[PDB]
């Protein structure tokens, strides 16, 4: 009773009561919240690192894997087969590779060259060099990870200290070393901490496993946290394993009231002074050295060995944790103490053996007590997250100390269960090591990498490089020359049609005008009043009229009768009476004009298909319908494309506006060309607005090298197969169908919606301009995208929504770059043609996709700036629609009669 009692008093600060352990537990609860907080994480000692492992195994894992295991007492390489054969969950083979101190303490290159060489040997010996086995890496050090296949070393701990590795992605270092060998290929798909491999190994057997605990060379624990509490990982969805890195608890000085002179001494002379202070009071690397330090002081005070002190006793590292373990054995402990101490150079007495055994007891029991306190905090955290009175959970455990000391796991369990009386906790020893669990992570990581690879290969066909875009620009320019020249105009796909509008507004226009706006989303009738002079004004009124698809695709007589009925209504709606008014007809389809008021429809585009219209003068069609009604008369002065009316609407205020652009249902552009270049119209004086009809660019096969399988499908299923190919890669009627076709393919490949191609997904038109624009909105978090997808009729998850948003973005970004290339061609032609070093030009623009999409206009302006750097283009969105400009055109047309 005496000796032990006195030893108890000497090491009293090491004998922790439950009150102190509850205090430590509470401190650690606070650290865990600091490490998860976005605000305190940069200065949190307990890093709470995201692992990107979102679940314990579910039984679907299967495959043949390689697992590396580095940082614990032994470097192992394993081949793990999982459900690779019936009635064999797992099958493992393993090899330990000697890794001496000069490799662990040398350069990073030398360390990773060592790993790559042992891996080569391992694959060589088993002839698996050509199997393409996905590789998992258990690397037991704190790492910053933004994905499963990255592991940026934060700090070396334990025995390792290789230069050039802290702050580097060890997956890249390892890849580098393997490549340098040139001997074999290795696909490193996942990096995990050993706590995480332990939790996964144990979770394969026990579905309640939510914690992985290591009490070996070093000590650490991981646990399943809720995403809503993990501030540094986006999402509030589900769970994710957190690597606490609890060994650094106390590194800021918060456990200085628990630490003793011995702890300070072992810390000062370690590889990493001041760091991993909690770990140094607990793990196998340090407990025997803590005991040696205590014996040395005691000896110096004559409390042991009659003051005998040998140099062996004084040798750091000479008394290990295995000696502590042997000394604490029930029957042989004292005998083992005798032998061990005898080898120290002393001649220990029997009483010395009893004393030394008690010092081992106190050191190893304080460690067990400390880990019980920190693990108790994680269990209270899990209990709080689950929200129940009692906690049921399984802790997976590994580490030499826990596995080999004759009393530690028993004492740890008992203290743990006493500290957390509300939990029913099972401790499962991880007998297979981290490798099994690492393989389960590797199986899931490999499946997701394969799905990512195929998604990226599909989406890469929509990526356009700057050189490719310069080539599209060049092709547009060449097609513009083809359509303007007499010799080549008839077989040119970009028609470059004269509008007979020869100047922008000169400020003298004035009068009251009617206008029609047909071909976009809304058919409208308008009344426009323009007044010039002191303070010019424009006053406009309009009504929208529906045009059912049966009249858009019925007879020309029916369509024009319908337009005339709407005009009759609008005249009553406005109270218009009196002499017949001048009218400008915005008709957004390609027409061959012989003057401002005559336009023969060349072909239908978008969704129109009315019969007996193509090859007819549409002004004559309108005038015929007015005569059939025999009520009002009208003076149709002009037929205009919507590009041209949009340009004139903008040029009313801007002298630099010489270009019009539509990105709505369809896509097209117009611009002021020199009469000398307009070979199809006699005269070489002045300018003429040209309606490009650029939608048909590509209808001669000139964009076949960038059209995808999905563009081909959209055109093949369209109303005008083979026509308007460029427009079908850009505009609002067609982008949603490109997206829909990509989503169907991904759903069939099992990447989205559980492989379920619903009937909603098979319905054409679902990704309308409104919805595509909503899904990409920056200030719309997950819940709203899913809300939209679910609301359309699709069974979408958070991951589903993210992939849906990505696909939408790839398609709208390519449409905006393609539109940008065509616009870069037009502005450089104007610049180059006027012999200018720089051009300052305004483009009047309109269209629903352009107006509503969150990124299209920005991407498109950026593209034009990069592809035509000597042009400074300003894009001005019409507020008023094509109307103000159609009326301006009509005014000059009346004027030009006189
Ligand atoms: N909190 C503590 N810290 C350090 N040593 C302790 C502590 N509590 C008890 N001990 C010591 O642990 C030993 C008791 O071990 P215990 O696991 O409870 O029973 P057993 O004798 O079966 O191993 C005694 O040597 C006692 O002095
Ligand atoms: O440091 P140790 O004593 O080796 O214990 C910890 C080690 O246990 C082994 O079973 C695991 O496979 C390793 O991944 C782990 O690092
Ligand atoms: O097809 P949309 O989305 O309707 O866009 C194109 C249309 O935009 C309107 O603002 C113009 O006034 C119309 O003349 C033009 O045709
Ligand atoms: O090997 C057990 C533990 O040792 C150290 O504490 C490492 O920092 C940690 O990553 C690891 O899990
Ligand atoms: O409405 C925008 C454009 O749609 C189509 O591309 C029409 O062919 C064109 O004339 C019109 O400008």
Coordinates of N, CA and C in Angstrom, one line a residue, residues 714-882:
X714 N -31.7 17.4 -82.7 CA -32.6 18.5 -82.7 C -33.0 18.9 -84.1
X715 N -32.1 18.9 -85.0 CA -32.4 19.3 -86.4 C -33.3 18.2 -87.1
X716 N -32.9 16.9 -86.8 CA -33.6 15.8 -87.4 C -35.1 15.8 -87.0
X717 N -35.4 16.2 -85.7 CA -36.7 16.2 -85.2 C -37.4 17.5 -85.4
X718 N -36.8 18.4 -86.0 CA -37.4 19.8 -86.2 C -38.4 19.9 -87.4
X719 N -39.1 21.0 -87.5 CA -40.0 21.2 -88.6 C -39.4 21.5 -89.9
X720 N -38.1 21.9 -89.9 CA -37.4 22.3 -91.1 C -36.0 21.6 -91.1
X721 N -36.1 20.2 -91.1 CA -34.8 19.5 -90.9 C -33.8 19.9 -92.0
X722 N -32.5 20.1 -91.6 CA -31.5 20.4 -92.5 C -31.3 22.0 -92.6
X723 N -32.3 22.8 -92.1 CA -32.2 24.2 -92.3 C -32.0 25.0 -91.0
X724 N -31.5 26.2 -91.1 CA -31.3 27.1 -90.0 C -30.4 26.4 -88.9
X725 N -29.4 25.8 -89.4 CA -28.5 25.1 -88.4 C -27.8 25.9 -87.4
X726 N -27.3 27.1 -87.8 CA -26.7 28.0 -86.7 C -27.6 28.5 -85.7
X727 N -28.8 28.9 -86.1 CA -29.9 29.4 -85.2 C -30.2 28.3 -84.3
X728 N -30.2 27.0 -84.8 CA -30.6 25.9 -83.9 C -29.5 25.6 -82.8
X729 N -28.3 26.2 -82.9 CA -27.4 26.1 -81.8 C -27.4 27.2 -80.9
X730 N -28.2 28.3 -81.2 CA -28.2 29.5 -80.5 C -29.5 29.9 -79.8
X731 N -30.6 29.7 -80.5 CA -31.8 30.4 -80.1 C -32.8 29.7 -79.2
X732 N -33.7 30.5 -78.7 CA -34.7 30.1 -77.7 C -35.6 29.0 -78.0
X733 N -35.9 28.9 -79.3 CA -36.8 27.7 -79.7 C -36.1 26.4 -79.5
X734 N -34.7 26.4 -79.6 CA -33.9 25.2 -79.7 C -33.0 24.8 -78.6
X735 N -32.4 25.7 -77.8 CA -31.5 25.3 -76.7 C -32.1 24.3 -75.7
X736 N -33.3 24.5 -75.3 CA -34.0 23.5 -74.4 C -34.0 22.1 -74.9
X737 N -34.2 21.9 -76.2 CA -34.2 20.6 -76.8 C -32.8 20.0 -76.9
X738 N -31.8 20.8 -77.0 CA -30.4 20.2 -77.0 C -30.2 19.7 -75.5
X739 N -30.5 20.5 -74.5 CA -30.4 20.1 -73.1 C -31.2 18.8 -72.9
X740 N -32.5 18.8 -73.3 CA -33.4 17.7 -73.1 C -32.7 16.4 -73.6
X741 N -32.1 16.4 -74.8 CA -31.5 15.3 -75.5 C -30.3 14.8 -74.7
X742 N -29.5 15.8 -74.2 CA -28.3 15.4 -73.4 C -28.9 14.7 -72.1
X743 N -29.9 15.2 -71.4 CA -30.4 14.7 -70.2 C -30.9 13.3 -70.4
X744 N -31.7 13.1 -71.5 CA -32.1 11.7 -71.8 C -31.0 10.7 -71.9
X745 N -29.9 11.0 -72.6 CA -28.8 10.2 -72.8 C -28.1 9.9 -71.4
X746 N -27.9 10.9 -70.6 CA -27.4 10.7 -69.3 C -28.3 9.9 -68.4
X747 N -29.6 10.0 -68.5 CA -30.5 9.2 -67.7 C -30.4 7.8 -68.2
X748 N -30.3 7.4 -69.4 CA -30.2 6.1 -69.9 C -28.9 5.4 -69.5
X749 N -27.8 6.2 -69.3 CA -26.5 5.8 -68.9 C -26.5 5.6 -67.4
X750 N -27.5 6.0 -66.6 CA -27.7 5.9 -65.2 C -27.0 7.0 -64.4
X751 N -26.7 8.1 -65.0 CA -26.0 9.2 -64.4 C -27.0 10.2 -63.7
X752 N -28.3 10.1 -64.0 CA -29.3 11.0 -63.6 C -30.6 10.3 -63.3
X753 N -31.4 10.8 -62.5 CA -32.8 10.4 -62.2 C -33.0 8.9 -61.9
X754 N -32.0 8.2 -61.4 CA -32.1 6.8 -61.2 C -32.3 5.9 -62.4
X755 N -32.0 6.5 -63.6 CA -32.1 5.7 -64.8 C -33.5 5.8 -65.4
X756 N -34.4 6.5 -64.8 CA -35.8 6.6 -65.2 C -36.2 7.7 -66.2
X757 N -36.3 7.4 -67.5 CA -36.7 8.3 -68.5 C -38.2 8.5 -68.4
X758 N -38.6 9.5 -67.6 CA -40.1 9.7 -67.4 C -40.7 10.2 -68.7
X759 N -42.1 10.2 -68.7 CA -42.8 10.7 -69.9 C -42.7 12.2 -70.0
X760 N -42.4 12.9 -68.8 CA -42.2 14.3 -68.9 C -40.9 14.6 -69.6
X761 N -39.9 13.8 -69.3 CA -38.6 14.0 -70.0 C -38.6 13.8 -71.5
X762 N -39.5 12.9 -71.9 CA -39.7 12.6 -73.3 C -40.6 13.6 -74.1
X763 N -41.1 14.6 -73.4 CA -41.9 15.6 -74.0 C -41.1 16.8 -74.6
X764 N -41.2 17.0 -75.9 CA -40.5 18.1 -76.5 C -41.1 19.5 -76.0
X765 N -40.2 20.4 -75.9 CA -40.4 21.8 -75.5 C -40.3 22.1 -74.0
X766 N -40.0 21.1 -73.2 CA -40.0 21.4 -71.7 C -38.9 22.4 -71.3
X767 N -37.7 22.5 -71.9 CA -36.7 23.4 -71.3 C -36.9 24.8 -72.1
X768 N -38.0 25.4 -71.9 CA -38.3 26.7 -72.6 C -37.3 27.8 -72.1
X769 N -37.2 28.9 -72.8 CA -36.2 29.9 -72.4 C -36.4 30.3 -71.0
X770 N -37.7 30.5 -70.5 CA -37.9 30.8 -69.1 C -37.2 29.8 -68.2
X771 N -37.4 28.5 -68.3 CA -36.8 27.5 -67.4 C -35.4 27.3 -67.5
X772 N -34.7 27.4 -68.6 CA -33.3 27.3 -68.8 C -32.6 28.5 -68.0
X773 N -33.2 29.6 -68.2 CA -32.7 30.9 -67.5 C -32.9 30.8 -66.0
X774 N -33.9 30.2 -65.5 CA -34.2 30.0 -64.1 C -33.2 29.0 -63.5
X775 N -33.0 27.9 -64.1 CA -32.0 26.9 -63.6 C -30.6 27.5 -63.5
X776 N -30.1 28.3 -64.4 CA -28.8 28.9 -64.2 C -28.6 30.1 -63.3
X777 N -29.7 30.6 -62.8 CA -29.6 31.9 -62.0 C -28.7 31.7 -60.8
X778 N -27.6 32.5 -60.8 CA -26.6 32.5 -59.7 C -27.2 32.6 -58.3
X779 N -28.2 33.4 -58.1 CA -28.8 33.6 -56.8 C -30.1 32.8 -56.7
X780 N -29.9 31.5 -56.8 CA -30.8 30.4 -56.7 C -30.0 29.2 -56.2
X781 N -30.3 28.9 -54.9 CA -29.7 27.8 -54.3 C -30.5 26.5 -54.7
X782 N -29.9 25.4 -54.6 CA -30.3 24.1 -54.8 C -31.8 23.8 -54.8
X783 N -32.4 24.1 -53.6 CA -33.8 23.9 -53.4 C -34.7 24.5 -54.5
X784 N -34.4 25.6 -55.1 CA -35.1 26.2 -56.2 C -34.9 25.5 -57.5
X785 N -33.7 25.0 -57.8 CA -33.5 24.2 -59.0 C -34.3 22.9 -59.0
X786 N -34.2 22.2 -57.9 CA -35.0 21.0 -57.7 C -36.5 21.3 -57.8
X787 N -36.9 22.4 -57.1 CA -38.2 22.9 -57.1 C -38.7 23.0 -58.6
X788 N -37.9 23.6 -59.5 CA -38.2 23.7 -60.9 C -38.3 22.4 -61.6
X789 N -37.2 21.6 -61.4 CA -37.2 20.3 -62.1 C -38.3 19.3 -61.7
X790 N -38.6 19.3 -60.4 CA -39.7 18.5 -59.8 C -41.0 19.0 -60.3
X791 N -41.2 20.4 -60.3 CA -42.4 21.0 -60.8 C -42.6 20.8 -62.3
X792 N -41.6 20.6 -63.1 CA -41.8 20.3 -64.5 C -42.4 18.9 -64.6
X793 N -41.8 18.0 -63.8 CA -42.3 16.6 -63.8 C -41.1 15.6 -63.6
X794 N -40.0 16.1 -63.2 CA -38.8 15.2 -63.0 C -38.5 14.9 -61.6
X795 N -38.1 13.7 -61.3 CA -37.7 13.2 -60.0 C -36.2 13.6 -59.7
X796 N -36.0 14.8 -59.4 CA -34.6 15.3 -59.2 C -34.1 15.4 -57.8
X797 N -32.9 15.1 -57.6 CA -32.2 15.2 -56.3 C -31.2 16.4 -56.4
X798 N -30.4 16.5 -55.3 CA -29.5 17.6 -55.3 C -28.4 17.4 -56.4
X799 N -27.9 16.1 -56.4 CA -26.8 15.8 -57.4 C -27.4 15.9 -58.8
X800 N -28.7 15.5 -59.0 CA -29.3 15.6 -60.2 C -29.4 17.0 -60.7
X801 N -29.9 17.9 -59.8 CA -30.0 19.3 -60.1 C -28.7 20.0 -60.5
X802 N -27.6 19.6 -59.9 CA -26.3 20.1 -60.2 C -25.8 19.7 -61.6
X803 N -26.1 18.5 -62.0 CA -25.7 18.0 -63.3 C -26.7 18.7 -64.3
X804 N -27.9 18.9 -63.9 CA -28.9 19.6 -64.8 C -28.4 21.0 -65.0
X805 N -28.0 21.7 -64.0 CA -27.5 23.1 -64.1 C -26.2 23.1 -65.0
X806 N -25.3 22.1 -64.8 CA -24.1 22.1 -65.6 C -24.4 22.0 -67.1
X807 N -25.3 21.1 -67.4 CA -25.6 20.8 -68.8 C -26.2 22.1 -69.5
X808 N -27.1 22.7 -68.8 CA -27.8 24.0 -69.3 C -26.7 25.0 -69.6
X809 N -25.7 25.1 -68.6 CA -24.7 26.1 -68.7 C -23.7 25.8 -69.9
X810 N -23.4 24.6 -70.2 CA -22.6 24.2 -71.3 C -23.3 24.6 -72.7
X811 N -24.6 24.4 -72.7 CA -25.3 24.7 -74.0 C -25.5 26.2 -74.1
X812 N -25.9 26.9 -73.1 CA -26.1 28.4 -73.2 C -24.8 29.1 -73.4
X813 N -23.7 28.6 -72.7 CA -22.4 29.2 -73.0 C -21.9 29.0 -74.4
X814 N -22.1 27.8 -75.0 CA -21.7 27.6 -76.4 C -22.6 28.5 -77.4
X815 N -23.9 28.6 -76.9 CA -24.7 29.5 -77.9 C -24.3 30.9 -77.9
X816 N -23.9 31.4 -76.7 CA -23.4 32.8 -76.6 C -22.1 32.9 -77.3
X817 N -21.2 31.9 -77.2 CA -19.9 32.1 -78.0 C -20.1 32.0 -79.5
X818 N -21.0 31.1 -79.9 CA -21.2 31.0 -81.4 C -21.9 32.3 -81.9
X819 N -22.9 32.9 -81.2 CA -23.5 34.2 -81.6 C -22.4 35.2 -81.6
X820 N -21.5 35.2 -80.6 CA -20.4 36.2 -80.5 C -19.5 36.1 -81.7
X821 N -19.2 34.9 -82.2 CA -18.3 34.8 -83.3 C -18.9 35.4 -84.6
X822 N -20.2 35.1 -84.7 CA -20.9 35.7 -85.9 C -20.9 37.2 -85.7
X823 N -21.2 37.7 -84.5 CA -21.2 39.2 -84.4 C -19.7 39.7 -84.6
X824 N -18.7 39.0 -84.2 CA -17.3 39.5 -84.4 C -17.0 39.6 -85.8
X825 N -17.6 38.8 -86.7 CA -17.4 38.9 -88.1 C -18.0 40.1 -88.7
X826 N -19.2 40.4 -88.4 CA -20.0 41.6 -88.8 C -19.2 42.9 -88.3
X827 N -18.8 43.0 -87.1 CA -18.2 44.3 -86.7 C -16.8 44.5 -87.4
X828 N -16.0 43.4 -87.5 CA -14.7 43.6 -88.1 C -14.9 43.9 -89.6
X829 N -16.0 43.3 -90.2 CA -16.2 43.7 -91.7 C -16.4 45.2 -91.7
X830 N -17.3 45.7 -90.9 CA -17.6 47.2 -90.9 C -16.3 47.9 -90.7
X831 N -15.5 47.5 -89.7 CA -14.3 48.3 -89.4 C -13.3 48.3 -90.6
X832 N -13.0 47.0 -91.0 CA -12.0 46.8 -92.0 C -12.6 47.5 -93.3
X833 N -13.8 47.4 -93.6 CA -14.3 48.1 -94.7 C -14.1 49.6 -94.7
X834 N -14.3 50.3 -93.6 CA -14.2 51.7 -93.6 C -12.7 52.2 -93.4
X835 N -11.8 51.3 -93.4 CA -10.4 51.6 -93.3 C -10.0 52.1 -91.9
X836 N -10.6 51.6 -90.9 CA -10.4 52.1 -89.5 C -9.6 51.2 -88.6
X837 N -8.8 51.8 -87.8 CA -7.9 51.2 -86.9 C -8.7 50.6 -85.7
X838 N -9.8 51.3 -85.3 CA -10.6 50.9 -84.2 C -12.0 51.3 -84.7
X839 N -13.0 50.5 -84.2 CA -14.4 50.9 -84.6 C -15.2 51.0 -83.3
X840 N -16.0 52.0 -83.0 CA -16.8 52.2 -81.9 C -18.3 52.0 -82.5
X841 N -18.9 50.9 -82.2 CA -20.2 50.6 -82.9 C -21.1 50.1 -81.9
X842 N -22.4 50.4 -82.1 CA -23.5 50.0 -81.2 C -24.3 49.0 -81.9
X843 N -24.8 47.9 -81.2 CA -25.6 46.9 -81.8 C -27.0 47.0 -81.0
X844 N -28.0 47.2 -81.7 CA -29.3 47.2 -81.0 C -29.7 45.7 -80.9
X845 N -30.1 45.3 -79.8 CA -30.5 43.9 -79.6 C -31.8 43.7 -78.9
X846 N -32.4 42.5 -79.3 CA -33.6 42.2 -78.6 C -33.8 40.6 -78.7
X847 N -34.8 40.1 -78.0 CA -35.1 38.7 -78.0 C -35.2 38.2 -76.5
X848 N -36.1 37.3 -76.3 CA -36.4 36.8 -74.9 C -35.2 36.1 -74.3
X849 N -34.6 35.2 -75.0 CA -33.4 34.5 -74.4 C -32.3 35.5 -74.0
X850 N -32.1 36.5 -74.9 CA -31.0 37.5 -74.6 C -31.4 38.3 -73.4
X851 N -32.7 38.7 -73.4 CA -33.1 39.5 -72.2 C -33.1 38.7 -70.9
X852 N -33.7 37.5 -70.9 CA -33.8 36.8 -69.7 C -32.6 36.0 -69.2
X853 N -31.8 35.5 -70.1 CA -30.7 34.6 -69.6 C -29.7 35.3 -68.7
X854 N -29.3 34.6 -67.6 CA -28.4 35.3 -66.7 C -27.0 35.4 -67.2
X855 N -26.5 34.6 -68.2 CA -25.1 34.6 -68.6 C -25.0 34.9 -70.1
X856 N -26.0 34.6 -70.9 CA -25.8 34.7 -72.4 C -25.3 36.0 -72.8
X857 N -25.9 37.1 -72.5 CA -25.4 38.4 -72.9 C -24.0 38.7 -72.5
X858 N -23.6 38.4 -71.3 CA -22.3 38.6 -70.8 C -21.2 37.8 -71.4
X859 N -21.5 36.5 -71.6 CA -20.6 35.7 -72.3 C -20.4 36.1 -73.8
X860 N -21.6 36.4 -74.4 CA -21.5 36.9 -75.8 C -20.7 38.2 -75.9
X861 N -20.9 39.2 -75.1 CA -20.1 40.5 -75.2 C -18.6 40.2 -75.0
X862 N -18.3 39.3 -74.1 CA -16.9 39.0 -73.8 C -16.3 38.3 -75.1
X863 N -17.0 37.4 -75.7 CA -16.5 36.8 -76.9 C -16.3 37.7 -78.0
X864 N -17.2 38.7 -78.3 CA -17.0 39.6 -79.3 C -15.7 40.5 -79.0
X865 N -15.6 40.9 -77.8 CA -14.4 41.7 -77.4 C -13.1 40.9 -77.7
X866 N -13.1 39.6 -77.3 CA -11.9 38.8 -77.6 C -11.6 38.4 -79.0
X867 N -12.7 38.2 -79.8 CA -12.5 37.8 -81.2 C -12.3 39.0 -82.2
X868 N -12.8 40.2 -81.8 CA -12.6 41.3 -82.7 C -12.1 42.5 -81.8
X869 N -10.8 42.4 -81.3 CA -10.2 43.3 -80.3 C -10.1 44.7 -80.8
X870 N -10.1 45.0 -82.1 CA -10.0 46.4 -82.5 C -11.4 47.0 -82.7
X871 N -12.5 46.3 -82.3 CA -13.8 46.9 -82.3 C -14.2 47.0 -80.8
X872 N -14.8 48.1 -80.5 CA -15.3 48.4 -79.2 C -16.8 48.3 -79.4
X873 N -17.5 47.3 -79.1 CA -18.9 47.1 -79.3 C -19.7 47.4 -78.1
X874 N -20.8 48.1 -78.3 CA -21.7 48.4 -77.2 C -23.1 47.8 -77.6
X875 N -23.6 46.9 -76.7 CA -24.9 46.2 -77.1 C -26.0 46.9 -76.3
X876 N -27.0 47.5 -77.0 CA -28.0 48.2 -76.3 C -29.4 47.5 -76.5
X877 N -30.0 47.0 -75.4 CA -31.2 46.2 -75.4 C -32.4 47.1 -75.7
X878 N -33.2 46.8 -76.7 CA -34.3 47.6 -77.0 C -35.3 47.5 -75.8
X879 N -35.9 48.7 -75.4 CA -36.9 48.6 -74.4 C -38.3 48.5 -75.1
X880 N -38.4 49.2 -76.2 CA -39.7 49.3 -76.9 C -40.1 48.3 -77.9
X881 N -39.1 47.4 -78.2 CA -39.5 46.3 -79.2 C -39.1 47.0 -80.6
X882 N -39.3 46.3 -81.7 CA -39.1 46.6 -83.0 C -39.9 47.8 -83.6

